[PDB]
Design an enzyme around this catalytic site. Structure first.
Site, PDB file in Angstrom:
ATOM      1  N   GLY A  39       1.353   1.364   6.655  1.00  0.00           N
ATOM      2  CA  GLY A  39       1.136   2.194   7.563  1.00  0.00           C
ATOM      3  C   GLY A  39      -0.013   2.682   8.086  1.00  0.00           C
ATOM      4  O   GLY A  39      -1.151   1.788   7.620  1.00  0.00           O
ATOM      5  N   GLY A  49      -2.735   6.168   8.539  1.00  0.00           N
ATOM      6  CA  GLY A  49      -3.205   7.501   8.233  1.00  0.00           C
ATOM      7  C   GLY A  49      -4.581   8.043   8.464  1.00  0.00           C
ATOM      8  O   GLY A  49      -4.703   8.378   9.763  1.00  0.00           O
ATOM      9  N   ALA A  50      -5.490   8.458   7.780  1.00  0.00           N
ATOM     10  CA  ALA A  50      -6.694   9.258   8.173  1.00  0.00           C
ATOM     11  C   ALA A  50      -7.473   8.780   9.313  1.00  0.00           C
ATOM     12  O   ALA A  50      -7.415   9.527  10.210  1.00  0.00           O
ATOM     13  CB  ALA A  50      -7.602   9.438   6.755  1.00  0.00           C
ATOM     14  N   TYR A  51      -8.081   7.691   9.286  1.00  0.00           N
ATOM     15  CA  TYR A  51      -8.775   6.998  10.099  1.00  0.00           C
ATOM     16  C   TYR A  51      -8.246   5.485  10.551  1.00  0.00           C
ATOM     17  O   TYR A  51      -9.162   4.621  10.781  1.00  0.00           O
ATOM     18  CB  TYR A  51     -10.272   6.712   9.994  1.00  0.00           C
ATOM     19  CG  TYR A  51     -11.053   8.431  10.087  1.00  0.00           C
ATOM     20  CD1 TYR A  51     -11.097   8.952  11.602  1.00  0.00           C
ATOM     21  CD2 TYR A  51     -11.645   9.085   9.219  1.00  0.00           C
ATOM     22  CE1 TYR A  51     -11.472  10.136  11.536  1.00  0.00           C
ATOM     23  CE2 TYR A  51     -11.983  10.186   9.351  1.00  0.00           C
ATOM     24  CZ  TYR A  51     -12.120  10.909  10.455  1.00  0.00           C
ATOM     25  OH  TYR A  51     -12.790  11.864  10.940  1.00  0.00           O
ATOM     26  N   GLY A  52      -7.137   5.280  10.375  1.00  0.00           N
ATOM     27  CA  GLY A  52      -6.273   3.889  10.763  1.00  0.00           C
ATOM     28  C   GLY A  52      -5.774   3.357   9.778  1.00  0.00           C
ATOM     29  O   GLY A  52      -4.657   3.704   9.164  1.00  0.00           O
ATOM     30  N   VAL A 111      -3.784   1.007   6.705  1.00  0.00           N
ATOM     31  CA  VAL A 111      -3.530   1.139   5.512  1.00  0.00           C
ATOM     32  C   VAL A 111      -2.644   0.121   4.893  1.00  0.00           C
ATOM     33  O   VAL A 111      -1.684  -0.170   5.560  1.00  0.00           O
ATOM     34  CB  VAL A 111      -2.990   2.510   4.759  1.00  0.00           C
ATOM     35  CG1 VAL A 111      -2.998   2.342   3.509  1.00  0.00           C
ATOM     36  CG2 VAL A 111      -3.759   3.424   5.252  1.00  0.00           C
ATOM     37  N   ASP A 130      -6.750  21.775   3.676  1.00  0.00           N
ATOM     38  CA  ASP A 130      -5.429  20.996   4.462  1.00  0.00           C
ATOM     39  C   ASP A 130      -4.263  20.612   3.751  1.00  0.00           C
ATOM     40  O   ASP A 130      -3.775  19.636   3.645  1.00  0.00           O
ATOM     41  CB  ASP A 130      -5.770  19.902   5.654  1.00  0.00           C
ATOM     42  CG  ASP A 130      -5.406  19.626   6.632  1.00  0.00           C
ATOM     43  OD1 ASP A 130      -4.123  20.231   7.098  1.00  0.00           O
ATOM     44  OD2 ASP A 130      -5.351  18.287   7.138  1.00  0.00           O
TER      45      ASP A 130
HETATM   46  C1  LIG Z   1      -4.065  11.201   1.346  1.00  0.00           C
HETATM   47  C2  LIG Z   1      -3.004  11.352   2.970  1.00  0.00           C
HETATM   48  C3  LIG Z   1      -2.212  10.105   2.962  1.00  0.00           C
HETATM   49  O1  LIG Z   1      -2.495   9.076   2.547  1.00  0.00           O
HETATM   50  N1  LIG Z   1      -0.752  10.310   3.680  1.00  0.00           N
HETATM   51  C4  LIG Z   1      -0.088   9.653   4.384  1.00  0.00           C
HETATM   52  C5  LIG Z   1      -0.804   8.614   5.169  1.00  0.00           C
HETATM   53  C6  LIG Z   1      -0.045   7.761   5.874  1.00  0.00           C
HETATM   54  C7  LIG Z   1       1.395   7.718   5.949  1.00  0.00           C
HETATM   55  N2  LIG Z   1       1.882   8.749   5.015  1.00  0.00           N
HETATM   56  C8  LIG Z   1       1.231   9.485   4.287  1.00  0.00           C
HETATM   57  C1  LIG Z   2      -0.008   5.112   4.892  1.00  0.00           C
HETATM   58  C2  LIG Z   2       0.329   5.440   3.884  1.00  0.00           C
HETATM   59  C3  LIG Z   2      -0.774   5.473   2.754  1.00  0.00           C
HETATM   60  O1  LIG Z   2      -2.190   5.841   3.101  1.00  0.00           O
HETATM   61  N1  LIG Z   2      -0.262   5.173   1.547  1.00  0.00           N
HETATM   62  C4  LIG Z   2      -1.119   5.601   0.154  1.00  0.00           C
HETATM   63  C5  LIG Z   2      -2.254   6.054   0.478  1.00  0.00           C
HETATM   64  C6  LIG Z   2      -2.866   6.263  -0.903  1.00  0.00           C
HETATM   65  C7  LIG Z   2      -2.266   5.596  -2.174  1.00  0.00           C
HETATM   66  N2  LIG Z   2      -1.147   5.155  -2.033  1.00  0.00           N
HETATM   67  C8  LIG Z   2      -0.531   5.175  -0.813  1.00  0.00           C
END
Ligand SMILES: *CCC(=O)Nc1cccnc1
Ligand SMILES: C=CC(=O)Nc1cccnc1
Length: 346
Positions: free
Chosen positions: A22, A24-27, A29, A139
């Site tokens: 998925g 998240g923060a700046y793109g 993962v 946050d």
């Molecule tokens: C630390 C925040 C985080 O990793 N949350 C998140 C990112 C992407 C998808 N779902 C949760």
């Molecule tokens: C998009 C999800 C994600 O960032 N997942 C995550 C982050 C940190 C550690 N494990 C899983």
């Protein structure tokens, strides 16, 4: 260089077999197999060097996470970047793989009272460490609480964190704010910059209420609507609590509202443990000065099965940013990110 959904995701050779997990923060993962520790890890790709705010939040997260060491706070295991500032375009941050988060869990799963209690304990245990370092997360919300398959909980995303500054917390009415709207304390809308520890406690209260019913307690649709929601449940503030708000525009707004009675927590949460609701009430106190502090919350009867202050560590020293990051040029911030990430290089 390996690719994922047409993007450069350039982490190898240490990290192989990228599976997209998925955005998240700046793109982007991905999970990946760490060929050194022999476990799957999470890797996030950060491309922040164009924008000053991107660089500021990235640098702030890295400095904090590298300084912190706690079981309920996500660590940085590795950082991947080019050997030179000139070639550095992206930064990859490698962290323990956490299969889910509390936002995803709440959308799909009913939590037992035992799970709610355990999650709340770990959130407060992590928060005790953060606050002991004179840091505010600012946050806290379900999507920033990571969980693994055994329900270990780790707080993440320190991009909006600040050093606490209570003597400079005061501001005018309707002052704009960055942190996620549904978890904002009432005083943010009235007279607060979110520079005190009580800001995080309100967020935790909101998270506790959301664990009790699987629905956010104060789902405001825009800035002032958030205060409508809070007052709809807590009811009108007392004379004493209004008198603490010296700002006239803020005071007079509250005085202009029709009287609203408090909604009893046991009517909102008829299945909740009574000790959970007593603790909830203390976290969701309107007056931030009367709001329970993290160490008091840990000592509350709700958490008696887990409370052990000798196993609830604090930071070895207070945190301080070297310079005010909010007026540094993006070339100095790229340079600072390069320096902060140097320890992970060969
Ligand atoms: C630390 C925040 C985080 O990793 N949350 C998140 C990112 C992407 C998808 N779902 C949760
Ligand atoms: C998009 C999800 C994600 O960032 N997942 C995550 C982050 C940190 C550690 N494990 C899983």
């Amino acid at each position: 260089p390996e690719m994922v959904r047409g993007q450069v995701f350039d982490v190898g050779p240490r990290y192989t077999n990228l599976s997209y997990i998925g955005e998240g923060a700046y793109g982007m993962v991905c999970s990946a197999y760490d060929n050194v520790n022999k476990v799957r890890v999470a890797i996030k790709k950060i491309s922040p060097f164009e924008h000053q705010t991107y660089c500021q939040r990235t640098l702030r997260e890295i400095k904090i996470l590298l300084r912190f060491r706690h079981e309920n706070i996500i660590g940085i295991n590795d950082i991947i970047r080019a050997p030179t500032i000139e070639q550095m375009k992206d930064v990859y941050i490698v962290q323990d793989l956490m299969e889910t988060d509390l936002y995803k869990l709440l959308k799909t799963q009913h939590l037992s009272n035992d799970h709610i209690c355990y999650f709340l304990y770990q959130i407060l245990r992590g928060l005790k460490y953060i606050h002991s370092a004179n840091v505010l997360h600012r946050d806290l919300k379900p999507s920033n609480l990571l969980l693994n398959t055994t329900c270990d909980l780790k707080i993440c995303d320190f991009g909006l964190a600040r050093v606490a500054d209570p003597d400079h917390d005061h501001t005018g009415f309707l002052t704009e704010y960055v942190a996620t709207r549904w978890y904002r304390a009432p005083e943010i809308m009235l007279n607060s910059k979110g520079y005190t520890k009580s800001i995080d406690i309100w967020s935790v209260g909101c998270i506790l209420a959301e664990m009790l019913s699987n629905r956010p307690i104060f789902p405001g649709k825009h800035y002032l609507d958030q205060l409508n929601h809070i007052l709809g449940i807590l009811g009108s503030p007392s004379q004493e609590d209004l008198n603490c708000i010296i700002n006239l525009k803020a005071r007079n707004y509250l005085l202009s509202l029709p009287h609203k009675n408090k909604v009893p927590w046991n009517r909102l949460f008829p299945n909740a443990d009574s000790k959970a609701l007593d603790l909830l009430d203390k976290m969701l106190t309107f007056n931030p000065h009367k709001r329970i502090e993290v160490e008091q919350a840990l000592a509350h009867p709700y958490l008696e099965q887990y409370y052990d202050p000798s196993d609830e560590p604090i930071a070895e020293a207070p945190f301080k940013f070297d310079m005010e990051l909010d007026d540094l040029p993006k070339e100095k911030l790229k340079e600072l990110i390069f320096e902060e990430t140097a320890r992970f290089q060969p």
